[PDB]
Amino acid sequence: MKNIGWMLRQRATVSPRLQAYVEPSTDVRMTYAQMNALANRCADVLTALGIAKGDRVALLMPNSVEFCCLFYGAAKLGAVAVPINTRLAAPEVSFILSDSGSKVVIYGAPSAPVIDAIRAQADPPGTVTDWIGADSLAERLRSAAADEPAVECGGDDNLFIMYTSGTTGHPKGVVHTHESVHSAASSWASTIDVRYRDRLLLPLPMFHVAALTTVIFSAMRGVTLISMPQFDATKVWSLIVEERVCIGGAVPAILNFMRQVPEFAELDAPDFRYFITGGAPMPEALIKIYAAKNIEVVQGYALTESCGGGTLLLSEDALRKAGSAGRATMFTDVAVRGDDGVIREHGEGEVVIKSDILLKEYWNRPEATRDAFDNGWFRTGDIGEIDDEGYLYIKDRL
Ligand SMILES: CCCCCCCCCCC[C@@H](O)NS(=O)(=O)OC[C@H]1O[C@@H](n2cnc3c(N)ncnc32)[C@H](O)[C@@H]1O
């Protein structure tokens, strides 16, 4: 069986001295050997905190090496990580904590006021036994052992619970296993043009499924993650050039706001090849602007339930199929479910997905889980059309 945590170790075996995590703003630089060593300390810390295989560990903190190492460490233990959106208010964070039955919460200094509010409320999440802030994590990690854990786990064992974007009415925990995450990161590494030793810019919050899949897929391919904790458009370009970024993740808005700053006018980053985007189509204009600087753009379509995987639109078809979500990526099949309940490869209907990247279930939501599955196919709830060329077009929501 595959184990996301073991994979980090294996990467540290293959490329021990390869730069794995680069964070300028904080001057935090680490090789894969060091990152894997930090995860082991993280695993030791969690164990002493009473975390056992299956147990949930909440992570409320800014992007950081600690975040990645904590879930990687959790992965080696068979524990389940619950990364939480840091823009969330106390009552919502509290909801996620009790719904997930998290027993340990690791939080950053910026989230202290949120953790304090929850702890002062009437009826705080009963399952939480420890609230570990930045200071305590530092203290604990310092006396932590760096030994490699020895726990047979992985495969279909839970690894993460990602709660569906804020609200739409039904906030649910999306549970992914080592296999579904492995398959997703595998899908990405096999679909987009990623290369060993490439340097990739991650400006997205690490609680986001796409971002999570990015740090994991980076370890799998042996990519140097370039971290920009809090996106800042006044520094993003110099980071791209000074750190010799080859690939960058972003949303259409960011890119449109980025080709505006002064630094853009005469940008000269030889190493930078393309941006990956999703969540909204890319305006033919915004594309051409970037095509100008010889910068390519790949656009994808995915959900939390698909672990950030799904369809993708290669640059070459950006204008030819502008307004399209692309085609199915490696290791994943996409089609449409009619009103007759019949699934077809072409035509309009509800976009359905069949791949190993799919969630195991909705955390403690039996009915929702069974209603999202139809003979192996996951119903996205999105209406769309697939043309004879096999390109997907996202319409309204079912
Ligand atoms: C192999 C590499 C794959 C790279 C995939 C990058 C995906 C970036 C977006 C991730 C979205 C994922 O996080 N799910 S979600 O919780 O954010 O929301 C999912 C919903 O967002 C919408 N929705 C996502 N992408 C789109 C879209 N490209 N075009 C119209 N709509 C969309 C659609 O309603 C979908 O059901």
The answer to whether 225 and 206 are in contact (CB under 8 A) is no
Across-strand partners of 174?
162, 362
Tokens of 307: 């672990």
Convert 143-176 to b/e letters by CB count within 10 Å (16 or more is b): ebeeeebebebbeebbbbbbbbeeeeeeebbbbb
61 lines ligand 1 (CB under 6 A): no
**Pairing mode of beta strands 377-386, 347-355:** antiparallel
Domain boundaries, position 299: 1-398
Which atom of ligand 1 lies nearest, measured to the CA of 381? Answer: 36
Atom of ligand 1 nearest to the CA of 281: 29
Q: Which atom of ligand 1 is nearest to the CA of 184?
A: 1
Distance 293 CA to ligand 1 centre (A): 26
Within a 10 A sphere around the Cβ of 199, how many other Cβ atoms?
21
Are 350 and 373 in contact by the 8 Å Cβ rule? The answer is no
Give the 3-state secondary structure of residue 11. helix
Residue 382 Cβ inside 6 Å of ligand 1? The answer reads yes
CA of 371 to the centre of ligand 1 (A): 21
Question: Do residues 99 and 91 touch, judged by C-beta distance below 8 A?
Answer: no
Give which of 111, 45, 47, 122 is closest to 84, Cα–Cα: 111
- Is residue 329 left, alpha or beta, with left meaning phi > 0 and alpha meaning psi from -120 to 50? beta
What backbone torsions phi and psi does residue 360 show, to the nearest 5 degrees? -80, -40
- By the 8 A CB rule, do 6 and 154 touch? yes
Task: Look up tokens 């290791």; give the residue.
Answer: 331
The secondary structure of 38-89, three-state, reads HHHHHHHHHHHCCCCCCCEEEEECCCCHHHHHHHHHHHHHCCEEEECCCCCC
Q: Residue 250 and residue 188: Cα distance in Å, rounded?
A: 15
Question: Exposed, middle or buried by CB within 10 Å (0-12, 13-18, 19+), for 314?
Answer: middle
Contacts of 136 (CB under 8 A, 6+ apart): none
CATH number, domain with residue 138: 3.40.50.12780
**Radius of gyration, alpha carbons of the chain:** 21
Kindly give the distance from the C-alpha atom of residue 139 to the centroid of ligand 1, in angstroms, as a whole number.
39
The vertex-228 CA angle with 227 and 230, nearest 5°, equals 140
- Taking the centre of ligand 1 as the mean of its atom positions, its distance from the CA of residue 361, in whole angstroms, is 19
d(CA 241, CA 42): 32
Q: Which residue has the tokens 């140097």?
A: 224
Q: Measured in angstroms, how far is the CA atom of residue 210 from the centroid of ligand 1?
A: 9
CA distance 119 to 125: 8
Q: What angle do CA 253, 257, 262 make, to 5 degrees?
A: 165
Tally of CA atoms within 13 A in the half-sphere of 208 that contains its CB: 17
- The structure's method of determination equals X-ray
Q: Beta 373-374 vs 377-386: how paired, if at all?
A: antiparallel
Residue pair 69/38 in contact (Cβ under 8 Å)? The answer is yes
Tokens of 19: 């730069």
| Ligand 1 center to 164 CA (angstroms) | 12
Q: Which residues contact 122 (CB under 8 A, 6 or more apart)?
A: none
Q: For ligand 1, is residue 305 a contact (CB within 6 Å)?
A: no
Q: Is 78 in the pocket of ligand 1 (CB under 6 A)?
A: no
Q: Six-digit token pair at 309?
A: 């995987």
Which of 193, 209, 297, 303 has most ligand 1 atoms within 8 Å of its beta carbon, as the pocket-test mutant? Answer: 303
Tokens found for residue 73: 């460490």
Rounded Cα–Cα distance for residues 98 and 54 (Å): 16
Say how many C-beta atoms besides its own lie within 10 A of residue 294's C-beta.
Answer: 12
From ligand 1's centre to the CA of 385, what distance in Å? Answer: 16
Per-position DSSP letters for 152-209, written without gaps between them? ---TTSEEEEEE-SS-SS---EEEEEHHHHHHHHHHHHHHS---TT-EEEE-S-TTSH
380 C-alpha vs ligand 1 centroid, how far in Å? 10
The tokens 């994590």 sit on which residue? 137
Alpha-carbon span 164 to 106, nearest angstrom: 20
Angle 181-323-387 from CA coordinates, rounded to 5°: 85
- CB of 165 within 6 A of ligand 1: the answer is yes
Cα separations in angstroms, 42 against 5, 71, 140, 276:
12, 8, 9, 31
Distance CA 83, CA 189 (A): 23
Decide: helix, strand or coil at residue 294. Answer: coil
Q: How many domains does the chain have?
A: 1
* Residue linked to tokens 């630089």: 29
Name the DSSP class of 129.
Answer: -
Residues contacting 307, CB < 8 A, separation 6+: 176, 180, 181, 183, 184, 209, 213, 357, 358, 359
Count the residues in the chain: 398
